[PDB]
């Protein structure tokens, strides 16, 4: 089997991407944030505290003839941005772009933190990291991809995120029309539960490539590119007036600037992030200070190849017995 679903930016900045997902019988379609950095499929629901729902579409398990309470199971997750959610668990039928999994754990939120409530466009998350990170207790549950894998034509999914435009998540096949050149594959460590790999270096604009190993994660659920302070300083030093602002929380730059591109290495191959992809717009409405799309990871503990990086490539998440990642230009 295969599936194919369009993923759409939630706003004019590409802050995140939503993909329609069918849950239950009859189908209830929710728009979920596919997140290769986490491993829980959770949704706003009829159980979510009413004051914490503000425009999201909810899953109502009592209206699904295929929903079953997973007795005793609870979940609770906290994300790198400080947001969080928690609740109980049902199993139900879940379909993405025509690919159906029966018995998928659907984690129903009883509580969500303010940032989730405040984002009316995201009805929940669909985790695509390794199932070892799933938070369901006392019996850990499998991701949608893990459950679908054996049925797929090939044990892979691909992320093709758009810049200010829709893109595609495919399951079970590699669309050879969706990228240019060849796909370069690179080793993955699953030891932390992430799609963790080592970039071979970087360049800023038309500058020379610096060969250096940068370990980080391919994370569709993180907006920006978080890299070591040395790399980020080298990037922003090429932008007149850019500075790191403690009050704003990262590098800012004059909105009048034209940003240089940023290149990262995948083996001997190179992915070029155009400068425009690094502009996240005014720090507050009407400001002429703009927020940078490349930021330091120094306070995180891990480098994160988020959407800024991934949307410059066609990315293969290869879930073969030994997982690997593939990157192509597009």
From Swiss-Prot:
User: Which residues are catalytic?
Assistant: 35, 199
Q: Which E.C. number(s) belong to this protein?
A: 3.4.23.22
Reactions this protein catalyses = Hydrolysis of proteins with specificity similar to that of pepsin A, prefers hydrophobic residues at P1 and P1', but does not cleave 14-Ala-|-Leu-15 in the B chain of insulin or Z-Glu-Tyr. Clots milk
State if Protease is listed as a keyword: yes
What are the TM regions of this chain, as residue ranges? none
Enzyme class label: hydrolase
Q: Which domain of life is it from?
A: Eukaryota
**The Peptidase A1 domain covers which part of the protein?**
17-328
Cystine connections: 255-290
Q: Which keywords does UniProt give here?
A: Aspartyl protease, Disulfide bond, Hydrolase, Protease, Signal, Zymogen
**Record's family?**
Belongs to the peptidase A1 family.
Q: What is this protein called?
A: Endothiapepsin
Species for this entry: Cryphonectria parasitica (Chestnut blight fungus)
Q: Which residues of the full protein are shown?
A: 90 to 419 of 419
């Amino acid at each position: 089997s295969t599936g194919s679903a369009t993923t759409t930016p939630i706003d004019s900045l590409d802050d995140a991407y939503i993909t329609p997902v069918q849950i239950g019988t009859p189908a209830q379609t929710l728009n979920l944030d596919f997140d290769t950095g986490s491993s829980d499929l959770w949704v706003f629901s009829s159980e979510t505290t009413a004051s914490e729902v503000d425009g999201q579409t909810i899953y109502t398990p009592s209206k699904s003839t295929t929903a079953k309470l997973l007795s005793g199971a609870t979940w609770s997750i906290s994300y790198g941005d400080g947001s969080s959610s928690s609740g109980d668990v049902y199993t139900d039928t879940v379909s993405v772009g025509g690919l159906t999994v029966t018995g998928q754990a659907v984690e129903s939120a009883k509580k969500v933190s303010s940032s989730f409530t405040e984002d009316s466009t995201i009805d929940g998350l669909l985790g695509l990291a390794f199932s070892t990170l799933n938070t369901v207790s006392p019996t850990q549950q499998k991701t949608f991809f893990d459950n679908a894998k054996a049925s797929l034509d090939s044990p892979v999914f691909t992320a093709d995120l758009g810049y200010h435009a829709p893109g595609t998540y495919n399951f079970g096949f590699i669309d050879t029309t969706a990228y240019t050149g060849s796909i370069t594959y690179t080793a993955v460590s699953t030891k932390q539960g992430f799609w963790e790999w080592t970039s071979t270096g970087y360049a800023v604009g038309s500058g020379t490539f610096k060969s250096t190993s940068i370990d980080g994660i391919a994370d569709t659920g993180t907006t920006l590119l978080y890299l070591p302070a040395t790399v980020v300083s080298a990037y922003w030093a090429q932008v007149s007036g850019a500075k790191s602002s403690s009050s704003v929380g990262g590098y800012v730059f004059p909105c009048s600037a034209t940003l240089p591109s940023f290149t990262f290495g995948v083996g001997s191959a190179r992915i070029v992030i155009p400068g425009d992809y690094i502009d996240f717009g005014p720090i507050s409405t009407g400001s002429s200070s703009c927020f940078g799309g490349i930021q330091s990871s120094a306070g995180i503990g891990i480098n994160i190849f988020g959407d800024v990086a991934l949307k410059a490539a066609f990315v293969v998440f290869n879930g073969a017995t030994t997982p690997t990642l593939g990157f192509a230009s597009k």
